[model samples]
Target: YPMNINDALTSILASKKYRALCPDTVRRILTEEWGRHKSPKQTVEAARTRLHGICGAYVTPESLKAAAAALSAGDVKKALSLHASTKERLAELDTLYDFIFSAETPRRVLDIACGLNPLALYERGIASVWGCDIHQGLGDVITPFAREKDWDFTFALQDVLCAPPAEAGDLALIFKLLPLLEREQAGSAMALLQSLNTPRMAVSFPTRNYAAWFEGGLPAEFEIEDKKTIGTELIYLIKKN
Candidate 1:
């Protein structure tokens, strides 16, 4: 193995300005310089293509508010919620969240099936999150919540199978929303979850038989796994192994 390598993706040779933007450029250049090379993933470029194709309309404060309102009313999110949970389940999810989001890594959170704002807001709040769904129109409500919390949040119409990894999330939350990922969506859902080599994660599934077939089917990493209820819905805590 070479002591140092360089990749000439950018001419960061003593050019500290661009290097300042992304320290990775220097490493990338160095990797190639030492003949140990790997190409950068297309996550950012893919994000642009997705943005140009999608309206990005779901990122507005109003859209977020609508989603929040919908969740508050339990009308829209009801379409996404799974089997009912008892008081025990709700307490468990709170405990689960506290554990999963407590990572030391610089964090970027992704909230799938986010019908409304789940965690707290304000700068220096509980968590910083980005959200998405088939309804990018939810941005009307989600954007406001992002502002209130200084959350780097936005919503998109990305199915798990289709969404490109613009950025691999530090944490992805798929809770109380298992039944929502239909069979057609399952492949991508699992692929995405298994693909996340992050420190922690949380996924919940319904206890009922209709959705029960998919239980115990997540990546083997979902250990410390348990069952609990969150307001008429049962959720399994799918944490990292």
Candidate 2:
């Protein structure tokens, strides 16, 4: 308790596991933990634990390094395999993309909490992509690959819960992100859906019970035009009225 909150913040963020996390989000969590009368060490432990639950569980620095190496060697599939989430959907990427783009091909895509998903879009004829993630290491890997492919792609280190982007896109992608957002803050998924500036969105959930989960959670103006199961993931094609 003797350590300054700023020092506690620095110590918490200095860990390799948290180094790439959104600083603002970490700061907020650190302050909240600090206000609970926890000592500096306890505060650091608590903040890191919370962060792990929020987004750290999905990050693998070794895998990120491997993905970057694979990408540099022109092994797109290998790079995709480095991330668990992306690897799970590898076999069905083509089918998933086809279903989502079946009704209308979007010119630009906005991917939120985008892990290594952007790499799967390598030759998908996507004109441009803007992806944001709480993990900065993913951006470090994605940005250079996009540049190498001469893609009009941008990656932002942003915590969408605190600030949703005002930029609009033809379609927005929220893949396997809702449950995580809900865990971080109650009702955040709905808030994000209402705040986004896209006309259409493809939201996916890993759980099969997603239908019931969305029953009364979605905004009234939004409708699920179609739902499909590719692999273990259930995807909903949504449109705003």
Candidate 3:
């Protein structure tokens, strides 16, 4: 990593990750940081190091919003193509999301450790969706997006284990989040799951190993409505009983 912006841009332009990104999108991110520093050369050098951590799957929020809108309009192929920069393609996961919410069509949703799940659901015309994550970009990316689109969406910075949002909705998403939470605290997953006021929740896990199936235990208060496997991922749709 060089301390020169010219050197950093040269290196990034030659990388596979940069190749996957839209040129204008790349410039937008880098240019803002580049302008913020007195030592412009050093600014891009730091950004280059940080961008590498996301691998070749980094998609800008503007691109994600555009893709979601396209998907909302039922342009499946185009939506997939647009959001392909992300590691997990939203279009491909339609089956899993369908199965999770098949029994219940929630008008309001609470998405924990949301990543971009709420955006995908919103694209399906689910309407009311809220998401929270530990990622700092939640405020920068999601907040204004909702304002601009006039969508019923909300996002905030949250460490689910320590300070899960007190807000509740008709349905909640715990998708692929339990293991990550448990790693930060032994019983954090169960605690958060039980604390949510939602009547139904869709929990999912990636099938990395056979033992991964039994890792997160459901609360006694909640009963499993159904379980299904899609690709190498397993999901449980549970309801309060």
Candidate 4:
């Protein structure tokens, strides 16, 4: 008897590290690898590797819980400190957000691959936010917190590479996310940029080797309106042409 897809899914979810990942993403990867004619064990291992590359490397459920708890306690700075990427921008968040909103004030924000960054928007009194990530635990932690805080915020378990949201907002944020997407699939970063339905987007990359990574430039339909560097992150404010 051969191991079925359900069996592979069960085995993949048995590990604590991957247990909280978005099931859709896990299944997508598992199905892809399984189709490659690999053994069940090999397929499971390959799925785990792909998942790690996608999001598992950057976050954990425990870290998300700690951040959510800190946010609940009204410690915004401490909350941001718990996440890997957000923590790096902690010292410069104020400056960064100020620069982001200086040109235009966006009442509604769409944060793609948000990862604890929405807490910053809440601190800034942003009217509404919609955040999405591949980590199911992120939504688990944020949905309750948003309700408790009386925030007009929502979260979704999304794999943006496969399906970018069609919803529009005043501004969409892609923070330190392009490189990861590019790593997963060539030209996917540009595809995501093209799919966005926002008037403006604030995209960022780590200063480390960004010039080399972003040599190709953005799509023809979009143009970089302004650029800034805050702390370790380099941000581009772009608009649809």
Candidate 5:
């Protein structure tokens, strides 16, 4: 049923009868449609379901194929130029990325609440990556994109407060997440930091207070190896050794 529904929807999209419709126009229509004739809760749910579908149906296939090819070829900048879905893309972390990932360790990455950080890894030629986010858009885009490109990357939908996913990597990225976790559960941030199976961790805080950033003590197990301020972010490269 799942496969049939997905295939049917996508096939209709590719059909000539529907192919002429512009993606943005159709997406706007869906948003407007959801916003109208729906309760507040239904409107939010519809936006999540419909908007994610719009991005997947319209943007992901071609952009992912081209971007992955460009990335595999060595045109770092050009490969990363492709944008899929509505997630915010941030590529201005040259200093921060290098500080955490330039070492001689295995380059497997686990990015929690990942939000385009997987793209950051993809740009740096890191082939093995795992990302998780509370939003459906991450899986909507990355799952199909990875399959299309046959990339060694994966993503999942999760709420870490309930139970952190059992993913282990050489490095775990928790960028701009502490405040949100703390807000979600009184000690979620600390509990998550303690539970991670990685040897190294890369944590970050935003300069914007509205990001709900944490500004206090860390677990005794963590030892800061490097720190940097890039753009509006404060990054800490730490190890549990």
Candidate 6:
């Protein structure tokens, strides 16, 4: 009954390679490899052999080993879902993506400091989806998503200020990363974009205080088209000049 997968789920699941594996299998795979248990020592996959640091019921010796294999290979998407905090947000995004599609012209996307959220790239219309983050641990997020989706998605470990991708995408989504910037990084990142002559970029900061992010006014290339506050986080969707 748990894996019954309603009609909607069946339709999406049908396109996937592992349709035989139910939603619970997904839950187990994610939980066994990526979550925190009541005690640091206790693991959801403890019942399985040679596993550590997660709590889930279906966690088995075979599945736990598989999860570990995936984790060792740098799969942050699955890893983040193991915890309820990130999973809830991902679910909300899943609902939001039902009908959204980008024009064929803007098929590629760049998500900066994406963390675990880029795991849902399929939900977005971007044909070629790539994300960048300073933390190498987040690379895992791209792994499971790549497996689910036929096309290979790329995740890079680099600071946004150091080198923005050479390939310009039709859409660039920078989420929840600007707030942590101190100034030099933010300026350098924007400068690199202007240097490359990107046509559009959507960036967000934690707060609406323009003073915190801008001093002499951001580059004229950017036009702030929309802004919204999602609880404490401030989001912006801007177009490039």
Best by lDDT: 2
| lDDT (Cα, 0-100) at 203 in candidate 5 | 86
Per-model CA lDDT versus the true structure: 0.46, 0.84, 0.64, 0.82, 0.62, 0.49
2 or 5: which has the higher lDDT? Answer: 2
| Models sorted by lDDT, best on top | 2, 4, 3, 5, 6, 1
Better of 3 and 6 by lDDT: 3
Clashes per candidate, residues 3 or more apart or on different chains? 38, 0, 0, 0, 0, 9
Most accurate candidate by TM-score? 2
At residue 190, give the lDDT of candidate 4: 82
Cα lDDT, model 1, residue 239: 59
Query: Against the true structure, what is each candidate's TM-score?
Result: 0.49, 0.93, 0.63, 0.92, 0.62, 0.54
- 105 Cα displacement, candidate 1 (Å): 12
Superposed Cα deviation of residue 16, candidate 2 (Å): 2.4
Q: What is the lDDT of residue 236 in candidate 2?
A: 92
- Residue-wise C-alpha lDDT for candidate 5, range 82-125, written one tens digit per residue: 55211222445565677677675456888887755576676577
| Residue range 1-241, candidate 4, lDDT tens digits | 2287777787767777778777778788888888999887777778778877777545676777787787678787887788788889988898999999997779999999898788888888998999988787777766777898899998988888668877789999999899888876788988898888898999999984665555456777788788888899999898988
In candidate 1, residue 181 scores what lDDT?
A: 44
Instruction: Indicate whether candidate 3 or candidate 4 has the larger lDDT.
Output: 4
Report the lDDT tens digits of candidate 2 across residue range 119-165: 87666888888898888888988889888889988988888877986
Q: Measured by TM-score, how close is model 5 to the native structure?
A: 0.62
- Residue 204 of model 3 has an lDDT of 73
Candidate 6 global lDDT: 0.49
Please give the range of 10 consecutive residues that has the lowest summed lDDT in model 3: 83-92
Q: Is candidate 2 or candidate 6 better by lDDT?
A: 2
